[PDB]
Design an enzyme around this catalytic site. Structure first.
Site, PDB file in Angstrom:
ATOM      1  N   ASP A  65     111.760  -0.973  27.237  1.00  0.00           N
ATOM      2  CA  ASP A  65     112.454  -1.980  28.040  1.00  0.00           C
ATOM      3  C   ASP A  65     111.785  -1.933  29.417  1.00  0.00           C
ATOM      4  O   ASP A  65     111.930  -0.928  30.149  1.00  0.00           O
ATOM      5  CB  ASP A  65     113.976  -1.626  28.160  1.00  0.00           C
ATOM      6  CG  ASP A  65     114.785  -2.630  29.040  1.00  0.00           C
ATOM      7  OD1 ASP A  65     114.191  -3.595  29.587  1.00  0.00           O
ATOM      8  OD2 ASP A  65     116.048  -2.452  29.191  1.00  0.00           O
ATOM      9  N   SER A 142      99.744 -17.597  33.165  1.00  0.00           N
ATOM     10  CA  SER A 142     100.196 -18.910  32.763  1.00  0.00           C
ATOM     11  C   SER A 142      99.564 -19.969  33.673  1.00  0.00           C
ATOM     12  O   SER A 142      99.338 -19.733  34.862  1.00  0.00           O
ATOM     13  CB  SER A 142     101.718 -18.983  32.978  1.00  0.00           C
ATOM     14  OG  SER A 142     102.206 -20.305  32.794  1.00  0.00           O
ATOM     15  N   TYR A 155     110.416 -19.540  37.051  1.00  0.00           N
ATOM     16  CA  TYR A 155     109.351 -19.085  36.135  1.00  0.00           C
ATOM     17  C   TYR A 155     108.007 -19.070  36.870  1.00  0.00           C
ATOM     18  O   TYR A 155     107.244 -18.078  36.861  1.00  0.00           O
ATOM     19  CB  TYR A 155     109.198 -20.057  34.943  1.00  0.00           C
ATOM     20  CG  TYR A 155     108.085 -19.701  34.003  1.00  0.00           C
ATOM     21  CD1 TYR A 155     108.162 -18.554  33.204  1.00  0.00           C
ATOM     22  CD2 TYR A 155     106.923 -20.458  33.967  1.00  0.00           C
ATOM     23  CE1 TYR A 155     107.122 -18.211  32.371  1.00  0.00           C
ATOM     24  CE2 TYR A 155     105.902 -20.146  33.154  1.00  0.00           C
ATOM     25  CZ  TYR A 155     105.990 -19.031  32.346  1.00  0.00           C
ATOM     26  OH  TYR A 155     104.990 -18.652  31.519  1.00  0.00           O
ATOM     27  N   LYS A 159     105.302 -16.100  37.792  1.00  0.00           N
ATOM     28  CA  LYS A 159     103.929 -16.165  37.362  1.00  0.00           C
ATOM     29  C   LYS A 159     102.892 -16.256  38.577  1.00  0.00           C
ATOM     30  O   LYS A 159     101.924 -15.521  38.583  1.00  0.00           O
ATOM     31  CB  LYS A 159     103.745 -17.304  36.357  1.00  0.00           C
ATOM     32  CG  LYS A 159     104.478 -17.058  34.949  1.00  0.00           C
ATOM     33  CD  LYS A 159     103.678 -15.948  34.176  1.00  0.00           C
ATOM     34  CE  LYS A 159     104.464 -15.181  33.053  1.00  0.00           C
ATOM     35  NZ  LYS A 159     103.395 -14.479  32.208  1.00  0.00           N
TER      36      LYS A 159
END
Ligand SMILES: C[C@]12CCC(=O)C[C@@H]1CC[C@@H]1[C@@H]2CC[C@]2(C)[C@@H](O)CC[C@@H]12
Ligand SMILES: C[C@]12CCC(=O)C[C@@H]1CC[C@@H]1[C@@H]2CC[C@]2(C)[C@@H](O)CC[C@@H]12
Lengths: 277, 277
Positions: A65, A142, A155, A159
């Site tokens: 984790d 990304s 997000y 990134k």
């Protein structure tokens, strides 16, 4: 003897496909630790492993984790070979919606898994690499790390953060012989409406739909096979002097260049607004 | 009547100087809510306010902890005018050191204040702006948001994150009449050694010293007056159609362009390594 690889986020997607690509390599050069947050998700990895006929002992799963530095340390102790030659930092979360509709916990979770999670892995694994004067780090990036996308505000924040983290580190790691690279992925073929409407205005809600429509069409026209993306990781892996950044596709580079050569952001914001809306 | 401004992080630096610049404006166009995490730090703001002779009622201080969405909501309710015309998201933390020497809590704190803190402010304040179809958001950026700096891995992560957050939002906010801009600052004239040595290797420790030496010399040669930086915020404020990004200096733009036009990152990493080391 073998190249020891530890990959995070192997329950699906790029991480799953990269893990079995490496473990099944005809040369048997790789020993892969495929790590996952919840062991209940490991079935898909083992189904793929069978399909590609990974030899026994080429692939092992660990629970990891990335939110918990104890879990990170427990998985590192499970690397029986006592080194990691290639660390692949791939675990990540998306988060899609009007900014004001996002729960604070969801925002913190995305940041914790995507950014702090990668920090925890690098803190755990970089020291022994720097000591040996060798090791490769590959980080799943990304297109949303390179340019802002509407309704992906958090997000994209996460990134973009990986970009700054990795670039900063690369400036330092150069003389240490430890090579870090981002693998910049476009789309990859790996709240409910009433929930979101309740948390935003009707006009933003409508823009969200428009964004989703456009996104779906970009995905259907442009999504890459994770098999093809995984081979770009392999290319980076084997490069005698890797660069900081690899791109899995040429698709988004014209949009990126337009971003790149107007630092005021005015051309990018205009072009992306027209592209989506 | 007046333009209502709420600024975060006013205990020092850019935030302090911007707050008193606006409140003291000869035209008296601005009502300023200068917010601070700890009210014990408010003395410096009031000393500056006196020096510039801010008229009574032009400046008010609020306690605001950007880590706590309740604190954010409590300060928003204290805006007696019932709107904010200009929101300035400036609170921020630095974090300097070898990545493996940084405490996990310090890493999470920087991310929480610098990124999630700005998310909390935008969630709290953007809705009424979108409804009115007007409002200006100014976010304090950094050169470290635009290019990675060694031993600033987590600071840069956080400042890169603000870039992605803001750019994503700007693509959406365009048709709403709400304008968001980053104000990109270079240096501004606003662990102990044994601690860091205990947490890293001697070779990294030495590179840290080298970085600090170079940083000090960049700062002594290049640091700007916060008075000069505050006026760039004013320029953005008054621009009839603001751009996404303002730069407070031309200094770092050659380094940035070299970054910008080699997407592989190879030229940037090389040039920055040579520049620092
Ligand atoms: C988020 C999406 C769509 C879904 C996904 O897997 C990530 C991917 C990244 C590229 C984005 C795309 C949405 C549509 C965009 C924004 C295009 O306009 C250009 C880049 C595209
Ligand atoms: C962190 C520093 C130094 C201290 C500061 O206030 C922020 C500032 C941002 C510009 C950096 C600088 C360190 C030296 C650098 C890295 C130069 O080489 C080019 C950009 C500079």
């Amino acid at each position: 003897a073998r190249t020891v690889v530890l990959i995070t986020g192997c329950s699906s997607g790029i991480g799953l496909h990269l893990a079995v690509r490496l473990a099944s390599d005809p040369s048997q050069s790789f020993k892969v630790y495929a790590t996952l947050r919840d062991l209940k998700t490991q079935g898909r990895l083992w189904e793929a492993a069978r399909a590609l006929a990974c030899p026994p002992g080429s692939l092992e799963t660990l629970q990891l984790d990335v939110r918990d530095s104890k879990s990170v340390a427990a998985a590192r102790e499970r690397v029986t070979e006592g080194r990691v030659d290639v660390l692949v930092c791939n675990a990540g979360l998306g988060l899609l919606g009007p900014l004001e509709a996002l729960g604070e916990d969801a925002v913190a979770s995305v940041l914790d898994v995507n950014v702090v999670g990668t920090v925890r892995m690098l803190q755990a694994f970089l020291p022994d690499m720097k000591r040996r004067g060798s090791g490769r780090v590959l980080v799943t990036g990304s297109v949303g790390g390179l340019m802002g996308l509407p309704f992906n505000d958090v997000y994209c924040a996460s990134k973009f953060a990986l970009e700054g983290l990795c670039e900063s580190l690369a400036v330092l790691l150069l003389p240490f012989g430890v090579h870090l690279s981002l693998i910049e992925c476009g789309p990859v073929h790996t709240g409910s409406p009433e929930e979101v409407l309740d948390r935003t205005d009707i006009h933003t809600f409508h823009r969200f739909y428009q964004y989703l429509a456009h996104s779906k069409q970009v995905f259907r026209e442009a999504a890459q096979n994770p098999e093809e993306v995984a081979e770009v990781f392999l290319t980076a892996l084997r490069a005698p002097k890797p660069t900081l950044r690899y791109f899995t596709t040429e698709r988004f580079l014209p949009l990126l260049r337009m971003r790149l050569d107007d630092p005021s952001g005015s051309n990018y914001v205009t072009a992306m607004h027209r592209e989506v809306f």
